[PDB]
Assembly symmetry: D2
C-alpha cells in the first residue's frame, strides 16, 4: 500500500521514522505523501492533528495511526517499542478500522467558508465584548455574553472541552458538545450554564449582536474573521478512520491519562 | 381505547380530571386502571413519575401524556386549557409516539433485585463513609470516595444530574450519564471529576470496599439495602412512549424552564 | 507542664505514644488527661478532631499539636521521626503559639443548643426535600432548595468545603465560608450559586419552610434534630491554639497534600 | 468643596449631570476636574471604573459616589431620582466614608511598571500556550497551564471572578482571590483547581517558562507586554473611599443584582 510518515521533528521521532521506513522497505509498501492509504504519525496528539489536516480531503481512503514518543496521547496511543510489530501487520493488511465523528463549522460573511475539526472549534471576540445570540434549530435559545463558546467532538471532549467543565463521552456516540467560557449571569443576562449535547442533524447557529469580528479556531489553526453574519455548527457526515491491531478501550485511555498509568 | 387518569390530589387537578372523564364519556373510550392503553397524568413531573412506576410492567402497550396544573414540567408539558382538545385527538387516534431511553439498575447481595428509572438512580452510604470501586466494562477505572454517585437518563439530565454539574443531552440519544457528588481529590484519592456519558451496552459496576450498606434510590423511591455485593448500571432495552399532538422540542422545553417563558 | 496523648488505636500509634511518654518521663512533665496544658494527637486529622472536641471547654489553656502516622494531615503535620525532638522543646517551653478561627453553630427549637466546629457544619433534610430561607444579618437573601449547605472554617476549607467547589483561604483570615450542595436553579428557584465569605460579626440564619427536622453535623458528630425553629452561623470568639517549633506555611501544606510531596 | 462629574455620554446621563451642576451652583461648591474632593460618576460600573483611574493618584483626598442611569451597579448604586437629595448632603458634609481594598500589580522586564486595580487583573498568552510557574511567598506552588489567571479584589469578586467560579467575599475583608481559567489537569500537569484567598502582605509571583509575552489587563485597560521576567500580585496599601448617605449592605446589592430586585 501507499504510506507516509510524519515526525515531530526531534531526534527520537526522526530516528524511529527512518527505522519504520527501512522496515517497510522489506515489504510491498510504497512511500507516497500525495495519495497515501496509511498515514503514520510519530510524536504526540498535536503531531497527529497536523497529519489529519494535511489529508482531510482524503479521509475516506486513509486509515490513520499514531505513535507517541512522549507520554500517552489519545490519538497517538502506540509505544515506540511496538513500531516493528506495527510494520508487520500493516503490510499483511486484514486489520480492522474504527471511525470517530467529526464537527463541521460553516462561517458566513457579507460567501461561505467551511472547516472540519477533530477536537473542537471555539469562538472569541477580538478586543471588545463577546455577545452572540444562540439559535438551536432555527429557534432562539439564549443570548450568551462572556469569553466565548466551545463546540467539541466526541473524541475531543478529553481536551479543551474537559477543562471547561464539559463531560467525557464515548467516541462511538455521533454527537457534539457545547460548553461555555466564563458566562455572565445576572438578572439581565441568562445563560443555561450546563453543557449541551446535540445529536446528529441538529444545527447550532451563532449570530452577532454588536461587533462582527470574531477570533475563530479549528483545532490548532486560529484566524481572525471580519464581518461575520453567522456561525453554524453541526455533526459532519465525514468520519476519521483508524487502524486497530489490539483492544485499547477509550475508557482505559482515559484512566491511563488522568487516573494513573 | 382503555384509559386512566391520575391526579395530584388537589382541587385544580381533581376538577380537571373529572372534566376529561366526562369529555371522554362522549366517545368510544373506556376507563380502566388495570390494562390501560392511554395513561394521563395531571399535576406535575412528580405526579408523572408515579404514573410511570404504576405501570412499568406494561410500558410497551401504553402511551403516556402529562398535564401540568402548575409550572411547565418536562414530562407534563400540556397546559390545562388544552385538555378539551386533548380528549378529541386521543379518541380519533392516528397520533404519533415518541420514545425515550431508560436506565436499568441491578443490585446483587449474598439474589438479584432490578429496577427501572426514568430520571436517575443514586447511591449513598448509610452513616459511614462512601467508598466504592468503579468498574467500567470489567475494567477497574477509579476508586471513588465522596458523598455518592448519580447515573442519569437522557431526559433525566435536566433534573438532579443538572444540579451536580452534568450536561444536558437530547433524549433521542441512547446513553446514560454518570456524575459525582462531592468527590475527594488529594494525592491519595484520584477521581476523574468530569461527567461520563456511556453508550448502549456499556456496563458500569459499583463494588464496595469496606461498608456493604448503601442508600440506593430510583427516581422517587429510596430504600436501604444491606450486604450489597455489586451495583450494575446500563441502558435499558425498554423505552417509555409518549403521545404527541404538536411539536414541542426538547430544547424549547429547556428554554422555557431555565431561560424564560 | 500537664500533658496528655491520644492515639489512633493501632500499633504504630500506640507504640509511638508510649515512647513519647517515656521520653516525657525524663523531664518535669506530668501526665494528666483532666486539665492538660499540652494535648498531643497521634494518628491523623480525624484523631486530631477528636482531641479538639474532648477539650473544647479548655481551649484557652491548651496548645494542640498533631503527629501523622499515615499521610500528611493539615492538623497532624509532624513526622513520627520528629517525636523525640518534639519532647525536648515541649519541656523547655519558650515555643510560639498560632491561633485559628472557629465556627459557632446555634440551634433553636420550640431552648438553645450551641456547638463549636473546627472544620465545618452542614445541614441536610431527613427524608423529605430540603428547603430553607437564608437570612443574612436579618435580611432575607435567598430560598435555598437542594441537598444542603456547608459553613466552613478557614482551616476547614481544605476539606468538605473544597469538595463542594469552595475556595481555600488562609487560616489567618477571621471569616467563614458558605457553599451549596446541589442547588436547584430553574425559573422559580433562584440561588446565588457562588460561595460566600462572611467576615466577623456577620450572622447567617437558616429558617425552615415546610419540614422542621434536619440532619445537622458538626465536624464528625452528626445528630438528628426535631422541631428546629432556626439555625444560626457566625464566627466564634474562641480560637484553637497550636504549638509551633518550625515554619510550615499553610500554602506549603496545601502543596504537599494536593500537588505533590 | 471642589467636585466634578463624569457622564456615560448619552442624553439620560448628560441631562442629569447638568441638573446636578445647577443644583450644586446653589451651594458653596466649586467645579474642578483637576483637584476635586468629590467625584460623582453617572452611568454604570464601567463609567465608575473610568472615574477611578482618572484620579488614582489622589485616592486619599477623594470620596467617590456613583449613580446608575441603567440597572443597579455595585459601585453606581444610586437611583437618578435621588440626585437632588444627594446634592444637599454633599454640600452640608458630615457624611461617613467607606473604604474598600485594592490590588497592586507589579510587572518586571529585562525596569518596573506598577498598576492599581479596583476589580481584577488577568494574565493571558499572546498566541502561543500560557505556561507559568506560580510562586507564593518565595515558595514554588504549582506550574499552571491553561488560558490564564485572574487575581480579584474583594469588591471585584462579583464580576469576572464570579464567572470563573470564584467566591464572593465581603469588601470589608482585606484580601485578594486568585482563580483559574480552563486549567489542564492530566497525569503530568497538576493545578490546585480551587480558588485561593490570600491575606494582606502575601505575594503571589507569576514567572514565565517558555514564552515571555503576556496580554495583561487591569480592570478595563489591556496592553501587551514583551519580555516579562515576573508578575507580582499583592494587596495594595491604598484604598478607595466612598460617600455613604444611607445603609446599602453589600449582601443586599448582591441580592438585588443576582436574585431579584
Ligand atoms: N483529543 C485530545 N484529548 C486529550 N488531549 C489532547 C487531545 N488533543 C490534543 Br492536541 N491533546 C493534548 C492537549 C494538550 O495536553
Ligand atoms: N426530568 C426532570 N427534569 C427536570 N425537572 C424534573 C424532572 N423530573 C422531575 Br420530578 N423534575 C422536577 C424536580 C423538582 O423541580
Ligand atoms: N481540615 C482538613 N483539611 C483537609 N483534610 C481534612 C481536614 N480535616 C480532616 Br478529618 N481531613 C481529612 C478528610 C478525609 O481525607
Ligand atoms: N465590581 C463589579 N461587580 C459586578 N459587576 C461589575 C463590576 N464592575 C463592573 Br464594570 N461590572 C459590570 C460587568 C459587566 O456586567
Amino acid at each position: 500500500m501507499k504510506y507516509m510518515i510524519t515526525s515531530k521533528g526531534d531526534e527520537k521521532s526522526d530516528l524511529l521514522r527512518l527505522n519504520m521506513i527501512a522496515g517497510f522497505g522489506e515489504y510491498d509498501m510504497e512511500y507516497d505523501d500525495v495519495e497515501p492509504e496509511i498515514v503514520i504519525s510519530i510524536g504526540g496528539d498535536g503531531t497527529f492533528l497536523s497529519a489529519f489536516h494535511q489529508y482531510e480531503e482524503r479521509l475516506d481512503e486513509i486509515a490513520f495511526i499514531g505513535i507517541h514518543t512522549g507520554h500517552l496521547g489519545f490519538y497517538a496511543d502506540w509505544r515506540p517499542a511496538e513500531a516493528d510489530k506495527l510494520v508487520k501487520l500493516l503490510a499483511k493488511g486484514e486489520y480492522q478500522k474504527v471511525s470517530y465523528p467529526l464537527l463541521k463549522t460553516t462561517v458566513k460573511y457579507g460567501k461561505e467558508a467551511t472547516y472540519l475539526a477533530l477536537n473542537e472549534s471555539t469562538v472569541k471576540s477580538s478586543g471588545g465584548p463577546f455577545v452572540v445570540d444562540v439559535v438551536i434549530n432555527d429557534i432562539h435559545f439564549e443570548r450568551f455574553r462572556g469569553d466565548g463558546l466551545c463546540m467539541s467532538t466526541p473524541s475531543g471532549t478529553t481536551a479543551y472541552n474537559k477543562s471547561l467543565g464539559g463531560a467525557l463521552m464515548h467516541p462511538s456516540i455521533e454527537a457534539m458538545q457545547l460548553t461555555e467560557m466564563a458566562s455572565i449571569n445576572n438578572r439581565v443576562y441568562r445563560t443555561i450554564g450546563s453543557p449541551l449535547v446535540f445529536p446528529k442533524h441538529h444545527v447550532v447557529s451563532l449570530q452577532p449582536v454588536n461587533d462582527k469580528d470574531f477570533q475563530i479556531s479549528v483545532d490548532h489553526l486560529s484566524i481572525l474573521h471580519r464581518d461575520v453574519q453567522e456561525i453554524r455548527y453541526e455533526v459532519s457526515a465525514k468520519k476519521i478512520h483508524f487502524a486497530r491491531f489490539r483492544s485499547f478501550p477509550f475508557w482505559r485511555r482515559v484512566h491511563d491519562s488522568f487516573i494513573e498509568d
